């Protein structure tokens, strides 16, 4: 892919006590046009881990497409194995580092987040096949927005309950809505516990527009 | 699968080959060919095997194959196992003219062949060629030259010459009455004429079941000659004059 | 494309088609050969003419460079791709490393080839077996032979062909390096060698030398009827 | 009387490879002696005319300047094994650094020990001894056309193999030293073969660890012959 | 004789024994049989214990092709395996390409071509395999399907693969099959195996029962077998 | 016999020879004895010697940190297989950053000696290997044969004379799941002492022992560490 | 960077010095510029650091094979043609290698230079590299056939000296090897900042 | 268009003790002007005497690490014993310069024991030169660590100094000063400073923090 | 230009019973000759000629290729070969080379090998073929070549005056040109017999 014709926007993600939380709205743009107002940007791998994406979305639904047999695949075998989040995250990396190579790459940008054996596990992949691990990763101009704001409340407080977490989310989706020229104020949220993995609805913020009366 | 397989590439027990052999025996049937060279000039002699009053004759031209401008060739064998040798042999010595822009000598051109129908014989199971044949033709280097080739890739120079199985008495005729560079083309005509009289068991020597083609020497153009039938009657009533004459003594 | 095996084991534990085919060399005509110190002599017989053809495409004798000669047995066709092969190679060889081939260079050459040749599926082995003889650089006259296996293996002596033990009997009492001493008592050491062979009145012998600093000479057929003639008058005393 | 090259027996064997077997033993014989102190090595070269020159006939062929080699069995089989078991410690050394152990050098030889097919000919009819001294001291090891590798003490193969295995389970043990283990390889040469002992007949190959290389110039093997 | 070497030549009488013989290979196996009620396919295997010989749930002849196909394999077993890995790959192309589920009618044409082509070549083997397919779908319905080793490929109501073949389809048609509930063919078809196969041939035997319908949401899984336990209790009442 | 010649031939019995033939090639190997507690895994075996001055053909080889087989039968086929099973291991360990189960991989083996047992031209694998490993859920013993069967068993013994290692192991297999390791594996070369003459068993030149465990790497011992697992055992009755 | 060789009476006289650098950046001081071959054969190192050091070594590996089935050492000529048809098989891919190859014969000395351009010349002085062209000055002012063993060796040691005192990228230490007919044997390997306190007085 | 490089930064320290070999790496990544993570070290510990660095482009040095690993245990079944420190730096340069006409973008410098007990320390280039040095510096702030130590380890420029060997914890010091006057001057230097010790007895670990700007 | 790299000029003209064709004779590169006797002419058979123009590796080449078939075409047959048949053969070995195409432009004249019937047609460098009935010209001086034949040509004339205003089309029209010169040989055929005459030119 030389050039991205339906994009998306920013995702976020942070860890929190037995579990990750995962959001991002659903708004396909093809440059300036807000052309989709209604798509899904998360896919929901089997039962422990889960996938976000950002970038191209014809690319995103060709990785829906093998992923999801590739689950299939082992789901038949019925040995009692599974993908842990790491070994998914493993293998993305391969896929985007193979793909750039041919000079002919996948214009996304990716963020797995997992919970398996009581461990909550958040991974982001590049384009470029850059991957790392951390406590709260942020896509696009998240990165430089949400980014300040999920530092500054982890490094003076480590560990975070699920409720402190998903309030922190809604916070930072509200400063993108304000500061991103290509966000929408539609937006679902996706959360990993022990108990599988859960989506939520279309959800909205509630915005501020008070000093637009002073001149 | 494996059974199936005819193995004609294999030695045989004596310590021979085995398949070249059974070929080798169909040249000696079915035609009847030769060529004398002694000095400017050469010939070839026909054989017509099939001489049936339906054909229509409208070839107007044979088992000699002009295959260059300098060389043709006279083959005996399965007959159209010579199309895929002639069609062959034809664009070798015409690409080796692409390449350096001069005529192909008429050594080289042979083992080009030779080559190609032994390739057959080392590897692969594919059947041989049931195919000898002759060679004519003028070169920079000596002049006029005959050659002789077999099924089995072997070749080399004569200058008198044998194909047909009737035509092995004809070598015990070709030793007892040839020259040392004596060729004036008549006397070279009135052997050849000679020879098909005794060998060839049809009586008499019609001209329709012969044919001669032979090449001369002109000033650069290299002239290749297939005579017509009516120089041949004259030819067989003065081989037949000869005969009547010679007779005298008895 | 032909996936199949032509030569496998046999349960006495030998190849067939090895000591199958140097029959077939043995049904060819003999060729003998000897070194000296200063002049190398090779001489093929049995050259049986009809006597009224061509002689100059029935050469039995060639070269590969201007170091190397060469003479065979066996069938004709099967010595004409591996000559013309090694004609190529000895070449190609001084396209790179830029000295002449030495003569048991081009001996390992023709020996693997014809080894693979045997060890590959759908292919017939040859049928040759080939004297090379050379004196390379230093001066040092030297001789090998083949084999259809394919075994390089130098010899001061070899006889081939139809016959090739008897003459090797009669070089089994002929180690005499006073016939070494002489160039020319060493080709009348080849010709009444060769007068051993089948009938060999003179005519059937066409031999040729290498005085090591010169292109391969063959004698003309006067010095074999003068050569013939001191051999017979060496002969008379006997008494 | 024509069957399979790649067919199981009905007992259960094989059919072709059990036939390769056979044919070592219509070849010369070897001897090869693994020491504490290096590995000597012998060979009878079986000479047939004095017209043939001795020396293009060779038995011990140098594989690495550390590794030496022994073969008995069709010559030009062998000598397709030798180069491409010298390229492959060249390959070793051009990506390492390092010099290929005696080992390891087998295991590379005997991967195409057997793999004759069609796609992708016949099993080779040579067997081989490999001596050579590496970080693990001298060694010593024999392989055969069937692909079975095995280390040996001493090991002794050809057409009087067997005879040269029973005689040298006697005079054998773990504390030799290299000369006795010489002189003793010899005596047991001279007993299996039919002709006399000469400068002629035979050829050695010591590697040590200290005389880094095998150096067997002729006339040191009459100095052994007399010594005998 | 002379005749029935390659499965590329036809007899004088015309046939091919080489699919002949690779028949009669699968009929010495074990029984596996198979049956359909309206809303759901059950299977169900007999397997041999020899004495001991593997750990149980070693190698299982129910395999498990796609979330909504299953198997039910019979005679040789190393080439029912690789028959699972060619109906694997078969529903994922068409997963790939049209984008929805495999129809059951379309997968049985796809192996009986692949099962034919062996057929009709020296150079490979027919297989010796038979097996079963069964699915559910709520557009469909439940339909079962069988193949023999030379290709025939169309539908039952119930079949039987095995030694006992005909001997165990006589008492297939004894029941009722339009108007049952599967969780009672369950305990139905382990009386099927439990009357046949007397123990004088092998002692110790053992049950699989696989089970696909509307009960199971379309999915395909294996019975809960240690759990509630009325097949081998309820196939035992036939002591008279 | 005309139609026992090729693997493609049925025969008219329905049983291809050619497979029947290589089941024999893998009784003439050297006994091996394999099987597993609840937590560890442990596979022994019985070298042999070509001469006196020739050291043993070893037969325990390690493939991945928890996965070692066992080998009966040809050598070829031996190092050709291991080099496809090293490979596989390796892959996975490349592309998912984790080790495969024992299992799935051995399901690989059998898709891999499926084809030369169907094609022309093409002989069976002569092997016999025992496969012992960790995946996620515990240890295991496979088994496998020419014809491409394998096995989930708990405890085997495959080449010459294992008729008399099998029945050794179903009068001691209920203790096969509590004992731990040192009585684990002095069970398991009782077993190997039936499979020989009556004149010699162990003696530190002919026994190899591999162990796979759950704080443990696949681990092979070779006559001189196996001398303390040969002491404490009683001689042969009569 | 900066090599030189010359022959004469007694035997190949190849100095270097031992700078290599990164842009205006100095990566080390201590580069052995000068690859060993063999016991009897030297190669050295032009331009690309990483060109010259492989495919001299994929050379040493064609001569042992060489020498393993011929029973003989390979001739200076023999090698310099092989390295000749390696490199031009990737020629305008942009390799950069102007090394040289020096090594005892048969013939005698040896002395050849091998480009990445496809040039393969003899002669009998030659200096390669960034500040070559102030080694061809001095040398070939002090350059005679007929010259001792310990003058030979003056004269590359201050060549060397030269050159690195008015180039930039040339420094550091210079080596010094002698071919023999034997084989090489290493001579000297001597500091930039003692040599200028020697030939300042 | 797609450009398939980019700047990750990362610095890279080792030094050839006389018995010993210390490896130093900081862990910030970052690319552009942003920060991905705090913690992300640069060791690898690949057998028990060696560690490798890796510095440049992220996305590179991830694939080549795990390239190496594979080749160890190629090594392993094939030999029946482990690699050297040099033959891991021979078998490096060939994997660098298979890739000529594409090259990594990768700093690289193995520290680790020779087989005498010796530190050795193999410094290398995108493209696959190497030599062995007594102390190399590699990634972004390597020219502000490169003249430091030539003054103090190599004693280099000072009259009448003495040649002392350098001990361990001098060199741990030394280490730890050079990193604190490096995150000073560059923006790439982060914050943890991890610290890898090769001895005889095995490979300690130690982390040091530097300031957070 | 690549076609002004050496230049030439090769005209034909159609008279009443014969057919004439001529060509100039410099070798050069752009701007330096080499020589006066670079042959631009080959005959194909008997009462048939080609000219070939353009850059001088390909007249060479092309003129090789086409004799290679033409032997072949011969040899199959036992006739020679009509004039149509040799447009459609040159036509189909310069669309073979569509995309690396040769730079050169043929011009092929000639009679009937039955009649006195004569023939003239000229192709592009991709082989579209081009019939007239009076002339055919080609090379890099083609417009100085269009306006003396549209100035002086007749339909029906003797092969004297065919001759004298070729002559006078050729002298006029090189002389003009730069690049081409050095000397123009003229070939004028007719059914009994074939004259070739060179003609005075300037030298400069």
């Not at chain 8, 003495?162 to 001990?167: A, C, F, G, K, Y």
Request: glycine share 8%.
């Amino acid at each position: 892919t030389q050039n991205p014709m339906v994009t998306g926007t920013s995702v976020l993600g942070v860890k929190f006590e037995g579990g990750v939380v995962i959001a991002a709205d659903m708004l396909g743009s093809y440059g300036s046009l807000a052309r989709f107002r209604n798509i899904s940007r998360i896919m929901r791998v089997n039962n422990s881990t889960m996938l976000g994406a950002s970038g191209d979305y014809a690319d995103f639904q060709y990785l829906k497409q093998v992923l999801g047999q590739m689950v299939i695949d082992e789901e038949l075998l019925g040995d009692g194995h599974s993908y842990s989040p790491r070994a998914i995250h493993s293998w993305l990396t391969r896929a985007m580092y193979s793909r750039r190579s041919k000079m002919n790459p996948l214009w996304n940008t990716m963020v797995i987040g997992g919970y398996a054996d009581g461990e909550s596990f958040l991974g982001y992949v590049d384009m470029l096949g850059v991957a790392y691990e951390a406590p709260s990763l942020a896509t696009g101009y998240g990165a430089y927005l949400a980014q300040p704001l999920l530092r500054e409340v982890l490094e003076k407080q480590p560990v975070l309950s699920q409720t402190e977490a998903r309030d922190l989310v809604e916070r930072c989706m509200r400063v993108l809505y304000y500061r991103d020229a290509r966000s929408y104020n539609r937006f679902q949220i996706a959360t990993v516990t022990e108990k599988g993995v859960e989506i939520e609805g279309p959800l909205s913020t509630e915005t501020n527009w008070d000093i637009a009366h002073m001149i | 699968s494996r059974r199936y397989d005819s193995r004609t590439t294999i030695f045989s027990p004596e310590g021979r080959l085995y398949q070249v052999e059974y070929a080798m025996e169909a040249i000696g049937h079915a035609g009847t060919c030769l060529g004398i060279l002694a000095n400017d000039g050469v010939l070839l002699a026909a054989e017509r095997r099939n001489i049936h009053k339906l054909l229509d004759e409208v070839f107007f031209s044979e088992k000699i194959y002009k295959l260059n401008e300098d060389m043709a060739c006279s083959v005996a064998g399965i007959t159209s196992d010579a199309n895929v040798l002639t069609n062959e042999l034809r664009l070798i010595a015409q690409r080796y003219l692409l390449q350096y822009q001069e005529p192909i000598p008429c050594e080289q051109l042979v083992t080009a062949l030779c080559d190609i129908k032994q390739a057959y014989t080392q590897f692969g199971g594919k059947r041989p060629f049931g195919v000898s044949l002759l060679y004519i033709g003028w070169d920079k280097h000596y002049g006029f030259q005959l050659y002789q080739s077999d099924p089995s890739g072997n070749y080399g120079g004569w200058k008198a010459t044998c194909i047909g199985n009737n035509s092995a008495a004809a070598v015990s005729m070709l030793k007892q009455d040839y020259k040392e560079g004596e060729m004036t083309l008549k006397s070279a005509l009135a052997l050849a004429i000679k020879v098909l009289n005794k060998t060839m068991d049809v009586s008499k020597l019609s001209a329709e079941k012969v044919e001669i083609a032979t090449l001369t020497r002109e000033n650069g153009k290299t002239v290749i000659r297939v005579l017509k039938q009516k120089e041949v009657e004259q030819l067989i009533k003065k081989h037949e004059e000869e005969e009547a004459k010679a007779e005298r003594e008895k | 494309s032909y996936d199949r095996a032509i030569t496998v084991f046999s349960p006495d534990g030998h190849l067939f088609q090895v000591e199958y085919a140097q029959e077939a060399v043995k049904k060819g005509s003999t060729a003998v050969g000897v070194r000296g110190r200063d002049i190398v002599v090779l001489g093929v017989e049995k050259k049986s003419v009809a006597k009224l053809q061509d002689e100059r495409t029935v050469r039995k004798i060639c070269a590969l460079d201007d170091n190397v000669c060469m003479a065979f047995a066996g069938l004709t066709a099967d010595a004409r791709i591996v000559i013309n092969r090694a004609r190529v190679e000895c070449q190609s060889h001084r396209l790179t490393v830029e000295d002449p081939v030495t003569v048991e260079y081009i001996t390992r050459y023709i020996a693997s080839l014809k080894q693979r040749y045997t060890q590959s599926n759908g292919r017939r082995p040859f049928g040759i077996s080939a004297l090379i003889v050379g004196f390379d650089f230093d001066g040092t006259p030297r001789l090998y032979q083949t084999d259809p296996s394919g075994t390089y293996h130098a010899w001061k002596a070899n006889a081939i062909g139809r016959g090739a033990k008897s003459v090797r009997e009669f070089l089994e009492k002929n180690y005499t390096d006073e016939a070494i001493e002489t160039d020319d008592l060493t080709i009348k050491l080849v010709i009444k060698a060769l007068l051993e062979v089948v009938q060999s009145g003179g005519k059937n012998i066409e031999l040729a030398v290498m005085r090591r600093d010169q292109s391969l000479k063959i004698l003309n057929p006067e010095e074999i009827e003068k050569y013939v003639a001191e051999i017979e008058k060496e002969k008379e005393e006997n008494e | 009387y024509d069957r399979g090259v790649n067919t199981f027996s009905p007992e259960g064997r094989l059919f072709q490879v059990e036939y390769a077997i056979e044919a070592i033993k219509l070849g010369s014989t070897a001897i090869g002696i693994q020491t504490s102190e290096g590995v000597c090595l012998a060979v009878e070269k079986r000479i047939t005319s004095p017209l043939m020159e001795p020396s293009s006939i060779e038995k011990i062929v140098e594989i690495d300047a550390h590794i030496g080699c022994a073969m008995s069995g069709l010559i030009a089989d062998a000598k397709t094994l030798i180069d491409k078991a010298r390229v492959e410690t060249q390959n070793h050394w051009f990506t390492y650094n390092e010099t290929m152990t005696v080992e390891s050098v087998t295991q590379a030889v005997s991967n195409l020990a057997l793999q004759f097919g069609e796609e992708d000919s016949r099993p080779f009819g040579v067997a081989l001894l490999f001596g050579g001294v590496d970080e693990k001291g001298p060694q010593l090891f024999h392989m055969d056309p069937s692909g079975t590798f095995v280390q040996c003490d001493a090991r002794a193969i050809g057409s009087a193999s067997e005879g040269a295995q029973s005689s040298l389970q006697e005079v054998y043990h773990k504390s030799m030293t290299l000369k006795e283990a010489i002189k003793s390889s010899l005596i047991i040469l001279k007993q299996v073969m039919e002709e006399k002992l000469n400068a002629t007949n035979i050829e050695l190959a010591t590697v040590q660890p200290g005389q880094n290389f095998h150096m067997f110039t002729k006339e040191e093997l009459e100095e052994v012959i007399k010594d005998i | 004789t002379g005749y029935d070497l390659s499965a590329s030549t036809f007899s004088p009488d015309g046939r091919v024994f080489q699919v002949e013989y690779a028949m009669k290979a699968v009929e010495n196996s074990s029984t596996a049989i198979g049956i359909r009620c309206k809303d759901g396919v059950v299977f169900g295997v007999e397997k041999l214990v020899l004495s001991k010989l593997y750990e149980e749930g070693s190698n299982k002849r129910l395999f498990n092709v796609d979330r909504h196909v299953g198997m039910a394999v019979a005679g040789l077993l190393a080439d029912a395996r690789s028959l699972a890995d060619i109906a694997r790959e078969e529903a994922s192309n068409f997963r790939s390409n049209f984008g929805y589920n495999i129809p059951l009618k379309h997968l049985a044409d796809r192996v009986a071509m692949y099962v034919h082509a062996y057929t009709l070549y020296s150079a490979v083997r027919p297989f010796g395999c038979s097996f079963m397919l069964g699915s559910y779908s709520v557009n469909d319905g439940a339909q079962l399907y069988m193949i023999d080793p030379s290709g025939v490929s169309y539908g039952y109501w119930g079949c039987a693969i095995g030694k006992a073949r005909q001997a165990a389809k006589t008492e297939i048609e004894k029941l009722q099959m339009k108007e049952m509930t599967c969780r009672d063919i369950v305990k139905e078809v382990a009386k099927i195996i439990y009357i046949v196969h007397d123990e004088v041939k092998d002692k110790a035997f053992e049950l699989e029962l696989s089970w696909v319908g509307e009960l199971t949401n379309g999915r395909h899984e294996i019975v809960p077998k240690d759990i509630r336990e009325e097949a081998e209790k309820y196939a035992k009442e036939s002591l008279k | 016999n005309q139609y026992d010649n090729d693997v493609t031939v049925w025969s008219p019995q329905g049983r291809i020879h050619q497979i029947e033939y290589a089941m024999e090639a893998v009784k003439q190997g050297s006994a091996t004895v394999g099987l597993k507690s609840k937590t560890h895994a442990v596979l022994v075996a019985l070298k042999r010697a070509q001469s006196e001055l020739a050291a043993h053909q070893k037969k325990i080889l390690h493939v991945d940190n928890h996965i070692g087989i066992s080998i009966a039968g040809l050598t070829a086929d031996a190092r050709l297989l291991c080099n496809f099973m090293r490979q596989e291991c390796l892959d996975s360990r490349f592309v998912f950053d984790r080790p495969l189960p024992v299992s799935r991989l051995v399901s690989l083996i059998g898709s891999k000696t499926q084809i030369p047992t169907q094609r022309y031209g093409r002989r069976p694998y002569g092997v016999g290997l025992l496969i012992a490993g960790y995946d996620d859920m515990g240890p295991h013993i496979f088994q496998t044969c020419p014809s491409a069967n394998y096995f989930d068993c708990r405890a085997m013994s495959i080449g010459a004379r294992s008729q008399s290692a099998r029945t050794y192991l179903e009068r001691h297999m209920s203790e096969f799941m509590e004992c731990n390791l040192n009585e684990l594996v002095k069970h398991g070369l009782r077993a190997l002492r039936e499979t020989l003459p009556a004149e010699q068993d162990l003696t530190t030149k002919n026994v190899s022992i591999g162990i796979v465990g759950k704080d443990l790497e696949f681990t092979i011992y070779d006559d001189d560490d196996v001398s303390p697992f040969l002491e404490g055992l009683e001689e042969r009755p009569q | 960077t900066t090599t030189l060789a010359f022959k004469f009476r007694h035997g190949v006289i190849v100095a270097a010095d031992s700078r290599a650098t990164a842009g205006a950046y100095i990566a080390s001081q201590t580069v052995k510029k000068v690859i060993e071959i063999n016991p009897y054969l030297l190669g050295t190192m032009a331009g690309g650091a990483a060109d010259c050091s492989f495919w001299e070594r994929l050379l040493a590996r064609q001569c042992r094979i060489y020498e393993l089935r011929n029973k003989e050492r390979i001739s200076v000529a023999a090698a310099s043609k092989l390295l000749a048809n390696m490199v031009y098989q990737y020629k305008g891919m942009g390799l950069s290698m102007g090394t040289m190859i020096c090594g005892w014969d048969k013939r005698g000395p040896g002395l050849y230079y091998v480009d990445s351009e496809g040039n393969r010349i003899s002669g009998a002085t030659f200096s390669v590299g960034s500040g070559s062209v102030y080694a061809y000055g001095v040398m070939d002012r002090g350059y005679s056939y007929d010259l001792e063993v310990e003058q030979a060796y003056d004269l590359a040691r201050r060549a060397i000296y030269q050159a690195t005192y008015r180039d930039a990228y040339s420094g550091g230490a210079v080596n010094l090897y002698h071919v023999r007919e034997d084989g090489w044997i290493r001579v000297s390997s001597d500091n930039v900042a003692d040599l200028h306190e020697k030939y300042s007085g | 268009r797609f450009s398939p490089y980019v700047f990750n930064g990362g610095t890279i320290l080792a030094i050839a003790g006389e018995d010993f070999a210390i490896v130093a790496s900081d862990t910030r990544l970052s690319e552009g002007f942003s920060i991905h993570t705090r913690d992300s070290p640069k060791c690898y510990k690949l057998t028990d005497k060696t560690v490798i660095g890796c510095s440049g482009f992220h996305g590179d040095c991830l694939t080549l690490t795990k390239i190496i690993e594979a080749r160890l245990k190629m090594y392993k079944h094939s030999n029946n014993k482990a690699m050297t420190t040099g033959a891991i730096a021979a078998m490096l340069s060939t994997i660098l310069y298979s890739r000529r006409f594409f090259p990594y973008y990768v700093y690289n410098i193995i520290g680790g024991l020779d087989e005498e007990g010796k530190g050795a320390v193999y410094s290398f280039d995108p493209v696959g030169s190497y030599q062995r040095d007594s102390f190399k510096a590699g990634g972004s702030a390597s020219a502000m660590l490169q003249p430091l130590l030539d003054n103090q380890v190599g004693f280099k420029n000072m009259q009448n100094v003495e040649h002392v060997p350098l001990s361990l914890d001098r060199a741990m010091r030394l280490v730890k000063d050079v990193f604190i006057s490096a995150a000073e001057r560059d923006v790439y230097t982060g914050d943890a400073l991890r610290i890898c010790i090769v001895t005889k007895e095995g490979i300690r670990e130690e982390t040091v923090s530097l300031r957070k700007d | 230009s690549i076609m002004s790299y050496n230049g030439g000029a090769v005209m034909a003209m159609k008279g009443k019973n014969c057919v004439a064709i001529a060509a100039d004779r410099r070798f050069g590169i752009q701007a330096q000759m080499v020589t006066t006797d670079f042959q631009k002419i080959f005959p194909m058979g008997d009462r048939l000629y080609i000219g070939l123009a353009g850059l001088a590796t390909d007249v060479q080449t092309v003129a090789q290729r086409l004799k290679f078939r033409l032997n072949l075409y011969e040899l199959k047959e036992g006739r020679q070969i009509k004039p149509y048949t040799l447009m459609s053969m040159v036509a189909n070995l310069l669309y073979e080379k569509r995309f690396g195409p040769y730079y050169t432009e043929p011009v092929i004249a000639g009679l009937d090998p039955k009649t006195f019937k004569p023939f003239i047609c000229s192709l592009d460098l991709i082989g579209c073929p081009m019939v007239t009935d009076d002339f055919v010209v080609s090379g890099t001086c083609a417009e100085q070549m269009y306006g003396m034949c549209e100035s002086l040509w007749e339909p029906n004339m003797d092969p004297d005056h065919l001759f004298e205003t070729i002559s006078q089309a050729m002298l006029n029209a090189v002389d003009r040109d730069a690049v081409s010169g050095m000397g123009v040989i003229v070939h004028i055929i007719e059914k009994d017999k074939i004259t070739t005459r060179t003609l005075k030119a300037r030298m400069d």
